[PDB]
């Protein structure tokens, strides 16, 4: 698949549509998320595309290389570590990310997994407590969706 899409939904007002496209040798992520509080929000690909218990059942960050949590520019990061999206004061975050670890086919494929947007900023694994090394202290999951194959 060269194109994928994710519709983010939750218990509150946060919603959004994320698009993925395999271009050249990388994946371009675009779209927008609305209803967010102004500022940064963690944005990650979680391991399972399981919504049976809301965003909880999506599990931890997609991490096939068994690394610790980090920022998207770090060597030591989870494949699902796409850092932070930034919402303006209208609560809108425009997503524009190009990432070297995720893919839409094979070992690193995020098709069938879950995209999650968090309540708080991702400290990019530099917070200094154990939690930083797992989730960047990004907190609860405001909205999520299973990543599907798009036309």
Q: Which residues are catalytic?
A: 44, 46, 61, 69, 78, 81, 118, 141
Q: In the stretch 84-113, what mask flags binding to a copy of itself with x, by CB under 8 A?
A: ---------------------------xxx
Q: How many CB atoms lie within 10 A of CB 116?
A: 26
In the complex with Zn ion, the residue whose CB is nearer, 31 or 72, is 72
Residue 115 near which of Zn ion, Cu ion, a copy of itself, none (CB within 5-8 Å, type-dependent):
none
Contact 136, 111 (CB under 8 A): no
In the complex with Cu ion, the residue whose CB is nearer, 110 or 116, is 116
Q: How many CB atoms lie within 10 A of CB 13?
A: 11
Torsion angles phi and psi, residue 130, rounded to 5: -60, -40
Tokens of 106: 């094979």
Residue 129 near which of a copy of itself, Cu ion, Zn ion, none (CB within 5-8 Å, type-dependent):
none
**If we measure between CA atoms, which residue out of 58, 49, 5 comes closest to residue 31?**
5
CB of 115 to Zn ion, least distance (A): 13
CA–CA dist 47, 64 (Å, integer): 9
Tokens of 30: 């675009």
Give the binding site for Cu ion (CB under 5 A).
44, 116
Give the binding site for a copy of itself (CB under 8 A).
1, 4-5, 7, 17, 47-52, 59, 111-114, 145-151
């Amino acid at each position: 698949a060269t194109k994928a899409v994710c519709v983010l939904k939750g218990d509150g007002p946060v919603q959004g549509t994320i698009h993925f496209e395999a271009k050249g040798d990388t994946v371009v992520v675009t779209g927008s998320i609305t209803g967010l509080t102004e500022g940064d929000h963690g944005f990650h690909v979680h391991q399972f595309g399981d919504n049976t218990q809301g965003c909880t059942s999506a599990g931890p960050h997609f991490n096939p290389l068994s690394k610790k949590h980090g920022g998207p520019k770090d060597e030591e990061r989870h494949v699902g570590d796409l850092g932070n999206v930034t919402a303006d004061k209208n609560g809108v975050a425009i997503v524009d990310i190009v990432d070297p670890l995720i893919s839409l086919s094979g070992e690193y494929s995020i098709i069938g997994r879950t995209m999650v947007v968090h309540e708080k900023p991702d400290d990019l694994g530099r917070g200094g407590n154990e939690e930083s090394t797992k989730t960047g202290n990004a907190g609860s999951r405001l909205a999520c969706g299973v990543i599907g194959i798009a036309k």
